[PDB]
Symmetry: C3
Subunit: 90 residues, 3 copies
C-alpha cells in the first residue's frame, strides 16, 4: 500500500511542522494520534506483504512440481526443502 | 535498508532515554520528529520491498513461460493465474 | 512477526486512548516509549521479510538451473538469471 503510506507520511511531516511551530500538549497528543494511524497502515502493509510472500511460495511449489513432472533431477529435493523452510518461516 | 533501519531505531532508543531522563516540551518534540524520520525510513524500505515483490512475480512468469515451452497445460494455466493475481495485489 | 505487530498496535491505540482521556508529560513519554517498542517490532518484521525475499531468489536461481539442465532456451534463461542477479544486488 505504498500510495496510502506516502500520503500518511506527507500528513505526518505537516502535523509535525505544525507542532514544531506552535508546540502544545494538545498539539503533541494530536501528533501522537497521527503516528498511531501511520503505524496502523505500516502494519496493514507488512501483513499484506507476508500474504503475498506466501502466495509466491505456493507458486514456486507448483513450479517445482511441474519440473518433477517432466523429469527434473530428483536437485528437486533440495529446492522443495527450501520451500518447506520458507513455509515454516512465514 | 535493513542496516540503515537498525541504526535508525537505536538512535531512537537513545533519544527515548535522553527524553525520559530530562522530559521537556522541546525534548518531546525532538523525540516526535525522530520518530517521523524512523517512519520515513520504514516507508522507504517497504516501497523497496514491493518493488522487489514485483520483480519476483516477473521472474515467476518468465519461469513459467520457459516451462510451457518445453511442455501440464492445466497446471500451467493454474500457475499463470496465481501469477496474474499476485500482480494484481501489487 | 505479523501477529505480534497486530498486538503491539492494539496496545498503542489503547495507550493513545488513555493519553487522550488524561494528557500528561509522563503519559506522553510512556506513549513515546511504546511507539519505539512498536517501531522495534516493525523493524524486526521487515528484517524477517528481506531474509525471506533472499530465500526466494535462491530458489528461483535453483529453478532456472533445473530448467537449463533439461534444455531450457538459453536466451530466455539468460534474461532470467539476469533479473535474478539484479534482485540479489537489490537485497
Amino acid at each position: 500500500g505504498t500510495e496510502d503510506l506516502k500520503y500518511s507520511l506527507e500528513r505526518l511531516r505537516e502535523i509535525l511542522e505544525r507542532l514544531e511551530e506552535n508546540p502544545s500538549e494538545k498539539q503533541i497528543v494530536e501528533a501522537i494520534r497521527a503516528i498511531v494511524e501511520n503505524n496502523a497502515q505500516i502494519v496493514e502493509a507488512i501483513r499484506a506483504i507476508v500474504e503475498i510472500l506466501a502466495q509466491i511460495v505456493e507458486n514456486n511449489r507448483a513450479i517445482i512440481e511441474a519440473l518433477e513432472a517432466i523429469g527434473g533431477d530428483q536437485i528437486l529435493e533440495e529446492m522443495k526443502k527450501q520451500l518447506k523452510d520458507l513455509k515454516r518461516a512465514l
